[PDB]
Amino acid sequence: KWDYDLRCGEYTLNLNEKTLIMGILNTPDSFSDGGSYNEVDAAVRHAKEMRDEGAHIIDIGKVSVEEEIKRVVPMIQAVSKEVKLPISIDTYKAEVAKQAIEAGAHIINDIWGAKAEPKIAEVAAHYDVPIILMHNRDNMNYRNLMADMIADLYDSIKIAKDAGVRDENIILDPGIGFAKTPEQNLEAMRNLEQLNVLGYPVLLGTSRKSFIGHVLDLPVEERLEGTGATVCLGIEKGCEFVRVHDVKEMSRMAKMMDAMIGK
Amino acid sequence: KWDYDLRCGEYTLNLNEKTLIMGILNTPDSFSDGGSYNEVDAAVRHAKEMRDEGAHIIDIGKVSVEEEIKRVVPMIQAVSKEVKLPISIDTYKAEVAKQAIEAGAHIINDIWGAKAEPKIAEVAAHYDVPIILMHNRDNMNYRNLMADMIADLYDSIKIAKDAGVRDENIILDPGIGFAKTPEQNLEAMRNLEQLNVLGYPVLLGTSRKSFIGHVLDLPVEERLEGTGATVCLGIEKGCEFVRVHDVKEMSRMAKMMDAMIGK
Ligand SMILES: C[C@H](CC(=O)O)c1n[nH]c2nc(N)[nH]c(=O)c2c1=O
Ligand SMILES: C[C@H](CC(=O)O)c1n[nH]c2nc(N)[nH]c(=O)c2c1=O
């Protein structure tokens, strides 16, 4: 199905053998601008735990560019040293992405799909790292949700390829919970398999999101079963990664799905 | 999609609004032949709890016919009185089914698909209750798993309709974990949607089953995430009921699936 592997510098991720689990890393120190022992040690311990629970990737990430870097760079430096898993930097700022990769991040994860700072795409091309382009927009005035999403996503692919990003370094994300009503988020989940025609790996990010709470009427800490459902549906519909808080659980559900769908 | 409701005497179950949850009821007293306060009270308390957690049906059920009845009849009598949910009797014996329905059971649940005691179908026709015909057989020598299953299931439909069972009183079950290798159970899950062509509601029974343990390499008590996956896939593939131990959890996953697939 995928005739290439996701090359992540020292690590390589096979897109065919299993659904890949992206673990979402935790919390700033109230009295520092970054780098402090408490916050960095907590981060490493969480990365390690997620590694132990079946995570394949560690996702690390309103403040200023300077602060954002002072905060995230120490974390990338420790985790990359002490946890042997590829790291993604959760940013949409060109300069943050540069610093993070220098610091040791392997993948860029951009919630604005390179539309907030097109220059991030250049950073991506330059360092030759995979980049995640999530669907986003500042409004929710659609005429055909899926059609519009695919157009939007495609506008991001163009910015990315125009910058020099190789096809094999592009991953897409439907941006669930972003610029979408609850009913719209459900509709996107329902038609997720349409993203496939674009020909790129898809990452799903639904963990504990508000639309699950809207369906089940449950608070964030009570959303493991709902997250689970969305992950299951997502894998059935062909997604290659899921981005989750509950690594132990979701890793188990994914593995079971994989076995059933034959992956 | 379904132009009829499942009529269960005093209760009616709509097949279209939501995935219906069948809760599996618990444990005999070591010093009695049945009816004892401890075992019946435990049963009622479990039924009540499952009712509270989102169960729509309570499933109640090598020993002799006489013992089987002495044991199950008191339970049906209490639960039916004290828990306002339809009851199914988990038996494949004609006389047990008769006694249970007299006792207050609303649905028959036959793991041998009316092939162990064809007369059970007559009991079904007579009392006009829905009957669940599960796929089973004494061997696993298939030539085309799904094709064979559908033939087998169909042999049960014939026994049932020959006995006078109305189409609207027939429910099917793929019999996962029965007469199937682990790889075969996975294949059945993978192609579950084929059961639909037969035109009857489908109930899925995978809870904590051994094939999940075989995939995840986890013991029975550690199979909630795997059960979850199978339930999710099952609903995506169109099943109308799921039969589960973990009612709270599975009810939540199902409800989320329903919302996503639009049910
Ligand atoms: C806003 C929220 C915050 C969080 O959950 O960490 C958040 N950040 N980044 C994200 N990045 C990707 N690729 N996909 C996502 O769905 C997503 C998020 O939901
Ligand atoms: C054998 C096992 C025992 C149990 O789990 O209660 C068991 N009994 N009855 C059952 N009845 C139906 N309709 N579907 C099933 O999958 C099933 C079972 O797995």
Side-chain angles (χ1 to χ4, degrees), chain B residues 22 24-25 59 61 90-91 108-111 132-134 172-178 203-207 209 243 245:
Chain B
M22 166 184 288
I24 304 177
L25 194 71
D59 193 51
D90 185 343
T91 189
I108 296 175
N109 176 24
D110 182 349
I111 58 167
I132 289 155
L133 309 164
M134 195 185 82
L172 276 35
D173 185 320
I176 303 303
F178 296 88
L203 170 155
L204 186 57
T206 54
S207 180
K209 282 242 176 59
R243 178 182 179 276
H245 298 87

PDB file of all heavy atoms in Angstrom, chain B residues 22 24-25 59 61 90-91 108-111 132-134 172-178 203-207 209 243 245, ligand 2:
ATOM      1  N   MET B  22     -26.617  -5.686  24.793  1.00  0.00           N
ATOM      2  CA  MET B  22     -27.018  -6.832  25.594  1.00  0.00           C
ATOM      3  C   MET B  22     -26.002  -7.119  26.710  1.00  0.00           C
ATOM      4  O   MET B  22     -24.850  -7.461  26.440  1.00  0.00           O
ATOM      5  CB  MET B  22     -27.214  -8.064  24.715  1.00  0.00           C
ATOM      6  CG  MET B  22     -27.292  -9.353  25.498  1.00  0.00           C
ATOM      7  SD  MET B  22     -27.422 -10.804  24.443  1.00  0.00           S
ATOM      8  CE  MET B  22     -29.109 -10.626  23.859  1.00  0.00           C
ATOM      9  N   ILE B  24     -24.357  -9.226  29.734  1.00  0.00           N
ATOM     10  CA  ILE B  24     -24.204 -10.634  30.103  1.00  0.00           C
ATOM     11  C   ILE B  24     -24.238 -10.814  31.627  1.00  0.00           C
ATOM     12  O   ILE B  24     -23.308 -10.389  32.323  1.00  0.00           O
ATOM     13  CB  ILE B  24     -22.855 -11.188  29.612  1.00  0.00           C
ATOM     14  CG1 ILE B  24     -22.707 -11.005  28.107  1.00  0.00           C
ATOM     15  CG2 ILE B  24     -22.715 -12.667  29.948  1.00  0.00           C
ATOM     16  CD1 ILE B  24     -21.367 -11.480  27.604  1.00  0.00           C
ATOM     17  N   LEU B  25     -25.280 -11.466  32.139  1.00  0.00           N
ATOM     18  CA  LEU B  25     -25.449 -11.616  33.598  1.00  0.00           C
ATOM     19  C   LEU B  25     -24.537 -12.689  34.225  1.00  0.00           C
ATOM     20  O   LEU B  25     -24.386 -13.785  33.682  1.00  0.00           O
ATOM     21  CB  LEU B  25     -26.918 -11.916  33.926  1.00  0.00           C
ATOM     22  CG  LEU B  25     -27.385 -11.799  35.384  1.00  0.00           C
ATOM     23  CD1 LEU B  25     -27.426 -10.346  35.807  1.00  0.00           C
ATOM     24  CD2 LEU B  25     -28.762 -12.421  35.550  1.00  0.00           C
ATOM     25  N   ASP B  59     -29.015 -10.688  29.427  1.00  0.00           N
ATOM     26  CA  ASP B  59     -28.846 -12.052  28.925  1.00  0.00           C
ATOM     27  C   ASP B  59     -28.579 -13.014  30.081  1.00  0.00           C
ATOM     28  O   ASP B  59     -27.566 -12.905  30.772  1.00  0.00           O
ATOM     29  CB  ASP B  59     -27.689 -12.106  27.911  1.00  0.00           C
ATOM     30  CG  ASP B  59     -27.665 -13.397  27.115  1.00  0.00           C
ATOM     31  OD1 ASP B  59     -28.718 -13.762  26.556  1.00  0.00           O
ATOM     32  OD2 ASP B  59     -26.593 -14.040  27.031  1.00  0.00           O
ATOM     33  N   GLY B  61     -28.023 -16.840  31.443  1.00  0.00           N
ATOM     34  CA  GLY B  61     -27.627 -18.197  31.106  1.00  0.00           C
ATOM     35  C   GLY B  61     -26.111 -18.343  31.155  1.00  0.00           C
ATOM     36  O   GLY B  61     -25.498 -19.066  30.359  1.00  0.00           O
ATOM     37  N   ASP B  90     -30.275 -17.649  27.644  1.00  0.00           N
ATOM     38  CA  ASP B  90     -29.125 -18.196  26.932  1.00  0.00           C
ATOM     39  C   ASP B  90     -29.159 -19.715  27.011  1.00  0.00           C
ATOM     40  O   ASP B  90     -28.498 -20.305  27.857  1.00  0.00           O
ATOM     41  CB  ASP B  90     -27.829 -17.664  27.564  1.00  0.00           C
ATOM     42  CG  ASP B  90     -26.571 -18.091  26.811  1.00  0.00           C
ATOM     43  OD1 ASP B  90     -26.629 -19.039  26.005  1.00  0.00           O
ATOM     44  OD2 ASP B  90     -25.508 -17.472  27.041  1.00  0.00           O
ATOM     45  N   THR B  91     -29.937 -20.349  26.136  1.00  0.00           N
ATOM     46  CA  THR B  91     -30.025 -21.805  26.113  1.00  0.00           C
ATOM     47  C   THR B  91     -30.143 -22.321  24.684  1.00  0.00           C
ATOM     48  O   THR B  91     -30.449 -21.562  23.766  1.00  0.00           O
ATOM     49  CB  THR B  91     -31.245 -22.301  26.896  1.00  0.00           C
ATOM     50  OG1 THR B  91     -31.187 -23.726  27.019  1.00  0.00           O
ATOM     51  CG2 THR B  91     -32.529 -21.908  26.176  1.00  0.00           C
ATOM     52  N   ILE B 108     -35.240 -15.621  23.048  1.00  0.00           N
ATOM     53  CA  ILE B 108     -34.450 -16.845  23.112  1.00  0.00           C
ATOM     54  C   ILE B 108     -33.109 -16.606  22.450  1.00  0.00           C
ATOM     55  O   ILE B 108     -33.033 -16.011  21.372  1.00  0.00           O
ATOM     56  CB  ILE B 108     -35.128 -17.992  22.348  1.00  0.00           C
ATOM     57  CG1 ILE B 108     -36.466 -18.350  22.990  1.00  0.00           C
ATOM     58  CG2 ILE B 108     -34.205 -19.206  22.272  1.00  0.00           C
ATOM     59  CD1 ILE B 108     -37.255 -19.408  22.227  1.00  0.00           C
ATOM     60  N   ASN B 109     -32.055 -17.102  23.081  1.00  0.00           N
ATOM     61  CA  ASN B 109     -30.699 -16.918  22.592  1.00  0.00           C
ATOM     62  C   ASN B 109     -29.986 -18.262  22.456  1.00  0.00           C
ATOM     63  O   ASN B 109     -29.460 -18.808  23.434  1.00  0.00           O
ATOM     64  CB  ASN B 109     -29.924 -15.998  23.541  1.00  0.00           C
ATOM     65  CG  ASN B 109     -28.477 -15.842  23.140  1.00  0.00           C
ATOM     66  OD1 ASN B 109     -28.134 -16.021  21.974  1.00  0.00           O
ATOM     67  ND2 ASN B 109     -27.613 -15.510  24.103  1.00  0.00           N
ATOM     68  N   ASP B 110     -29.950 -18.782  21.232  1.00  0.00           N
ATOM     69  CA  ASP B 110     -29.516 -20.150  20.985  1.00  0.00           C
ATOM     70  C   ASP B 110     -28.171 -20.246  20.278  1.00  0.00           C
ATOM     71  O   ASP B 110     -28.079 -19.981  19.079  1.00  0.00           O
ATOM     72  CB  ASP B 110     -30.572 -20.858  20.142  1.00  0.00           C
ATOM     73  CG  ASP B 110     -30.232 -22.305  19.877  1.00  0.00           C
ATOM     74  OD1 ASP B 110     -29.086 -22.714  20.154  1.00  0.00           O
ATOM     75  OD2 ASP B 110     -31.117 -23.038  19.400  1.00  0.00           O
ATOM     76  N   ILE B 111     -27.137 -20.662  21.003  1.00  0.00           N
ATOM     77  CA  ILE B 111     -25.794 -20.773  20.434  1.00  0.00           C
ATOM     78  C   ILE B 111     -25.624 -21.885  19.389  1.00  0.00           C
ATOM     79  O   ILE B 111     -24.597 -21.943  18.696  1.00  0.00           O
ATOM     80  CB  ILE B 111     -24.726 -20.960  21.515  1.00  0.00           C
ATOM     81  CG1 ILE B 111     -25.024 -22.211  22.340  1.00  0.00           C
ATOM     82  CG2 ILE B 111     -24.645 -19.731  22.396  1.00  0.00           C
ATOM     83  CD1 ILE B 111     -23.864 -22.636  23.223  1.00  0.00           C
ATOM     84  N   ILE B 132     -32.518 -15.663  18.650  1.00  0.00           N
ATOM     85  CA  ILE B 132     -31.185 -15.391  18.143  1.00  0.00           C
ATOM     86  C   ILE B 132     -30.577 -16.695  17.660  1.00  0.00           C
ATOM     87  O   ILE B 132     -30.398 -17.617  18.451  1.00  0.00           O
ATOM     88  CB  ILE B 132     -30.291 -14.818  19.253  1.00  0.00           C
ATOM     89  CG1 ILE B 132     -30.722 -13.399  19.613  1.00  0.00           C
ATOM     90  CG2 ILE B 132     -28.833 -14.838  18.854  1.00  0.00           C
ATOM     91  CD1 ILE B 132     -30.321 -13.020  21.040  1.00  0.00           C
ATOM     92  N   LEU B 133     -30.276 -16.775  16.363  1.00  0.00           N
ATOM     93  CA  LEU B 133     -29.660 -17.962  15.795  1.00  0.00           C
ATOM     94  C   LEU B 133     -28.195 -17.686  15.568  1.00  0.00           C
ATOM     95  O   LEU B 133     -27.835 -16.962  14.635  1.00  0.00           O
ATOM     96  CB  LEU B 133     -30.312 -18.343  14.459  1.00  0.00           C
ATOM     97  CG  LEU B 133     -31.837 -18.443  14.505  1.00  0.00           C
ATOM     98  CD1 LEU B 133     -32.451 -18.436  13.104  1.00  0.00           C
ATOM     99  CD2 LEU B 133     -32.288 -19.664  15.307  1.00  0.00           C
ATOM    100  N   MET B 134     -27.348 -18.261  16.418  1.00  0.00           N
ATOM    101  CA  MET B 134     -25.909 -18.090  16.278  1.00  0.00           C
ATOM    102  C   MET B 134     -25.301 -19.130  15.337  1.00  0.00           C
ATOM    103  O   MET B 134     -25.727 -20.284  15.307  1.00  0.00           O
ATOM    104  CB  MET B 134     -25.225 -18.204  17.635  1.00  0.00           C
ATOM    105  CG  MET B 134     -23.803 -17.692  17.625  1.00  0.00           C
ATOM    106  SD  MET B 134     -22.950 -17.948  19.194  1.00  0.00           S
ATOM    107  CE  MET B 134     -22.462 -19.655  18.997  1.00  0.00           C
ATOM    108  N   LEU B 172     -29.670 -12.808  13.776  1.00  0.00           N
ATOM    109  CA  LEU B 172     -28.515 -13.657  13.509  1.00  0.00           C
ATOM    110  C   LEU B 172     -27.281 -13.247  14.335  1.00  0.00           C
ATOM    111  O   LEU B 172     -27.155 -12.097  14.765  1.00  0.00           O
ATOM    112  CB  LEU B 172     -28.186 -13.648  12.003  1.00  0.00           C
ATOM    113  CG  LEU B 172     -28.934 -14.601  11.049  1.00  0.00           C
ATOM    114  CD1 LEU B 172     -30.366 -14.813  11.448  1.00  0.00           C
ATOM    115  CD2 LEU B 172     -28.830 -14.139   9.573  1.00  0.00           C
ATOM    116  N   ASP B 173     -26.369 -14.199  14.524  1.00  0.00           N
ATOM    117  CA  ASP B 173     -25.130 -13.991  15.264  1.00  0.00           C
ATOM    118  C   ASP B 173     -24.019 -14.789  14.573  1.00  0.00           C
ATOM    119  O   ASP B 173     -24.189 -15.974  14.302  1.00  0.00           O
ATOM    120  CB  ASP B 173     -25.333 -14.471  16.710  1.00  0.00           C
ATOM    121  CG  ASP B 173     -24.144 -14.183  17.605  1.00  0.00           C
ATOM    122  OD1 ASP B 173     -22.987 -14.335  17.154  1.00  0.00           O
ATOM    123  OD2 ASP B 173     -24.369 -13.806  18.777  1.00  0.00           O
ATOM    124  N   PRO B 174     -22.881 -14.141  14.261  1.00  0.00           N
ATOM    125  CA  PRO B 174     -21.825 -14.848  13.524  1.00  0.00           C
ATOM    126  C   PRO B 174     -21.102 -15.919  14.336  1.00  0.00           C
ATOM    127  O   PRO B 174     -20.266 -16.625  13.779  1.00  0.00           O
ATOM    128  CB  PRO B 174     -20.837 -13.732  13.161  1.00  0.00           C
ATOM    129  CG  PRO B 174     -21.106 -12.635  14.108  1.00  0.00           C
ATOM    130  CD  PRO B 174     -22.577 -12.706  14.406  1.00  0.00           C
ATOM    131  N   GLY B 175     -21.390 -16.036  15.629  1.00  0.00           N
ATOM    132  CA  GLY B 175     -20.732 -17.063  16.415  1.00  0.00           C
ATOM    133  C   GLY B 175     -19.211 -16.953  16.454  1.00  0.00           C
ATOM    134  O   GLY B 175     -18.507 -17.956  16.311  1.00  0.00           O
ATOM    135  N   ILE B 176     -18.701 -15.736  16.636  1.00  0.00           N
ATOM    136  CA  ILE B 176     -17.275 -15.523  16.863  1.00  0.00           C
ATOM    137  C   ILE B 176     -16.840 -16.317  18.089  1.00  0.00           C
ATOM    138  O   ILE B 176     -17.584 -16.404  19.064  1.00  0.00           O
ATOM    139  CB  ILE B 176     -16.997 -14.055  17.188  1.00  0.00           C
ATOM    140  CG1 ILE B 176     -17.505 -13.148  16.064  1.00  0.00           C
ATOM    141  CG2 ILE B 176     -15.515 -13.842  17.498  1.00  0.00           C
ATOM    142  CD1 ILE B 176     -16.935 -13.463  14.715  1.00  0.00           C
ATOM    143  N   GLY B 177     -15.638 -16.882  18.032  1.00  0.00           N
ATOM    144  CA  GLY B 177     -15.091 -17.664  19.120  1.00  0.00           C
ATOM    145  C   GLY B 177     -15.612 -19.084  19.135  1.00  0.00           C
ATOM    146  O   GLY B 177     -15.247 -19.885  20.006  1.00  0.00           O
ATOM    147  N   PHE B 178     -16.485 -19.391  18.182  1.00  0.00           N
ATOM    148  CA  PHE B 178     -17.049 -20.734  18.050  1.00  0.00           C
ATOM    149  C   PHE B 178     -16.618 -21.429  16.768  1.00  0.00           C
ATOM    150  O   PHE B 178     -16.717 -20.857  15.680  1.00  0.00           O
ATOM    151  CB  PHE B 178     -18.570 -20.682  18.090  1.00  0.00           C
ATOM    152  CG  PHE B 178     -19.123 -20.201  19.396  1.00  0.00           C
ATOM    153  CD1 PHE B 178     -19.312 -18.849  19.620  1.00  0.00           C
ATOM    154  CD2 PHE B 178     -19.460 -21.102  20.393  1.00  0.00           C
ATOM    155  CE1 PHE B 178     -19.832 -18.401  20.806  1.00  0.00           C
ATOM    156  CE2 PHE B 178     -19.979 -20.659  21.588  1.00  0.00           C
ATOM    157  CZ  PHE B 178     -20.168 -19.309  21.796  1.00  0.00           C
ATOM    158  N   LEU B 203     -26.530  -9.698  15.741  1.00  0.00           N
ATOM    159  CA  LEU B 203     -25.981  -9.462  17.075  1.00  0.00           C
ATOM    160  C   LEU B 203     -24.553  -9.975  17.119  1.00  0.00           C
ATOM    161  O   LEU B 203     -24.269 -11.067  16.631  1.00  0.00           O
ATOM    162  CB  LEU B 203     -26.835 -10.164  18.114  1.00  0.00           C
ATOM    163  CG  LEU B 203     -26.320 -10.234  19.552  1.00  0.00           C
ATOM    164  CD1 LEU B 203     -27.507 -10.393  20.447  1.00  0.00           C
ATOM    165  CD2 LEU B 203     -25.343 -11.387  19.711  1.00  0.00           C
ATOM    166  N   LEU B 204     -23.649  -9.177  17.670  1.00  0.00           N
ATOM    167  CA  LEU B 204     -22.242  -9.564  17.745  1.00  0.00           C
ATOM    168  C   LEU B 204     -21.851  -9.950  19.172  1.00  0.00           C
ATOM    169  O   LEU B 204     -22.191  -9.250  20.130  1.00  0.00           O
ATOM    170  CB  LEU B 204     -21.353  -8.427  17.261  1.00  0.00           C
ATOM    171  CG  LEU B 204     -19.864  -8.746  17.151  1.00  0.00           C
ATOM    172  CD1 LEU B 204     -19.651  -9.940  16.239  1.00  0.00           C
ATOM    173  CD2 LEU B 204     -19.091  -7.550  16.628  1.00  0.00           C
ATOM    174  N   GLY B 205     -21.135 -11.060  19.314  1.00  0.00           N
ATOM    175  CA  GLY B 205     -20.741 -11.535  20.627  1.00  0.00           C
ATOM    176  C   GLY B 205     -19.260 -11.831  20.655  1.00  0.00           C
ATOM    177  O   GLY B 205     -18.836 -12.933  20.310  1.00  0.00           O
ATOM    178  N   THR B 206     -18.473 -10.834  21.046  1.00  0.00           N
ATOM    179  CA  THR B 206     -17.021 -10.948  21.037  1.00  0.00           C
ATOM    180  C   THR B 206     -16.392 -10.675  22.412  1.00  0.00           C
ATOM    181  O   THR B 206     -15.184 -10.838  22.570  1.00  0.00           O
ATOM    182  CB  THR B 206     -16.398  -9.954  20.045  1.00  0.00           C
ATOM    183  OG1 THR B 206     -16.872  -8.637  20.339  1.00  0.00           O
ATOM    184  CG2 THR B 206     -16.783 -10.305  18.618  1.00  0.00           C
ATOM    185  N   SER B 207     -17.208 -10.270  23.394  1.00  0.00           N
ATOM    186  CA  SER B 207     -16.696  -9.733  24.660  1.00  0.00           C
ATOM    187  C   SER B 207     -15.618 -10.602  25.293  1.00  0.00           C
ATOM    188  O   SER B 207     -15.847 -11.773  25.587  1.00  0.00           O
ATOM    189  CB  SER B 207     -17.819  -9.512  25.673  1.00  0.00           C
ATOM    190  OG  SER B 207     -17.301  -8.992  26.893  1.00  0.00           O
ATOM    191  N   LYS B 209     -13.392 -12.331  24.443  1.00  0.00           N
ATOM    192  CA  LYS B 209     -13.143 -13.646  23.869  1.00  0.00           C
ATOM    193  C   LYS B 209     -11.657 -13.946  23.681  1.00  0.00           C
ATOM    194  O   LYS B 209     -10.815 -13.046  23.603  1.00  0.00           O
ATOM    195  CB  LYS B 209     -13.904 -13.821  22.547  1.00  0.00           C
ATOM    196  CG  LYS B 209     -15.391 -14.115  22.719  1.00  0.00           C
ATOM    197  CD  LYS B 209     -15.748 -15.472  22.133  1.00  0.00           C
ATOM    198  CE  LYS B 209     -17.196 -15.826  22.392  1.00  0.00           C
ATOM    199  NZ  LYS B 209     -18.111 -14.818  21.809  1.00  0.00           N
ATOM    200  N   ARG B 243     -23.242  -7.962  22.420  1.00  0.00           N
ATOM    201  CA  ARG B 243     -23.385  -8.683  23.677  1.00  0.00           C
ATOM    202  C   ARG B 243     -22.087  -8.588  24.465  1.00  0.00           C
ATOM    203  O   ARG B 243     -21.065  -9.140  24.056  1.00  0.00           O
ATOM    204  CB  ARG B 243     -23.719 -10.138  23.396  1.00  0.00           C
ATOM    205  CG  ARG B 243     -23.846 -10.989  24.642  1.00  0.00           C
ATOM    206  CD  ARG B 243     -24.124 -12.407  24.224  1.00  0.00           C
ATOM    207  NE  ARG B 243     -24.251 -13.334  25.332  1.00  0.00           N
ATOM    208  CZ  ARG B 243     -23.225 -13.926  25.928  1.00  0.00           C
ATOM    209  NH1 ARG B 243     -21.990 -13.671  25.522  1.00  0.00           N
ATOM    210  NH2 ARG B 243     -23.437 -14.771  26.926  1.00  0.00           N
ATOM    211  N   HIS B 245     -19.763  -7.836  28.396  1.00  0.00           N
ATOM    212  CA  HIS B 245     -19.670  -7.886  29.855  1.00  0.00           C
ATOM    213  C   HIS B 245     -19.557  -6.486  30.423  1.00  0.00           C
ATOM    214  O   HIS B 245     -20.200  -6.158  31.417  1.00  0.00           O
ATOM    215  CB  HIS B 245     -18.459  -8.688  30.309  1.00  0.00           C
ATOM    216  CG  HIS B 245     -18.488 -10.124  29.897  1.00  0.00           C
ATOM    217  ND1 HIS B 245     -18.011 -10.558  28.679  1.00  0.00           N
ATOM    218  CD2 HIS B 245     -18.920 -11.231  30.548  1.00  0.00           C
ATOM    219  CE1 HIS B 245     -18.149 -11.870  28.598  1.00  0.00           C
ATOM    220  NE2 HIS B 245     -18.700 -12.303  29.718  1.00  0.00           N
TER     221      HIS B 245
HETATM  222  C1  LIG C   2     -19.907 -19.483  25.386  1.00  0.00           C
HETATM  223  C2  LIG C   2     -20.156 -18.059  25.757  1.00  0.00           C
HETATM  224  C3  LIG C   2     -20.325 -17.958  27.238  1.00  0.00           C
HETATM  225  C4  LIG C   2     -20.533 -16.532  27.610  1.00  0.00           C
HETATM  226  O1  LIG C   2     -19.771 -15.633  27.142  1.00  0.00           O
HETATM  227  O2  LIG C   2     -21.588 -16.229  28.222  1.00  0.00           O
HETATM  228  C5  LIG C   2     -21.364 -17.561  25.026  1.00  0.00           C
HETATM  229  N1  LIG C   2     -22.577 -17.906  25.391  1.00  0.00           N
HETATM  230  N2  LIG C   2     -23.658 -17.475  24.676  1.00  0.00           N
HETATM  231  C6  LIG C   2     -23.564 -16.644  23.507  1.00  0.00           C
HETATM  232  N3  LIG C   2     -24.746 -16.302  22.908  1.00  0.00           N
HETATM  233  C7  LIG C   2     -24.752 -15.509  21.756  1.00  0.00           C
HETATM  234  N4  LIG C   2     -25.981 -15.175  21.131  1.00  0.00           N
HETATM  235  N5  LIG C   2     -23.477 -15.044  21.224  1.00  0.00           N
HETATM  236  C8  LIG C   2     -22.289 -15.416  21.864  1.00  0.00           C
HETATM  237  O3  LIG C   2     -21.082 -15.014  21.339  1.00  0.00           O
HETATM  238  C9  LIG C   2     -22.346 -16.245  23.045  1.00  0.00           C
HETATM  239  C10 LIG C   2     -21.169 -16.708  23.822  1.00  0.00           C
HETATM  240  O4  LIG C   2     -19.893 -16.324  23.478  1.00  0.00           O
END
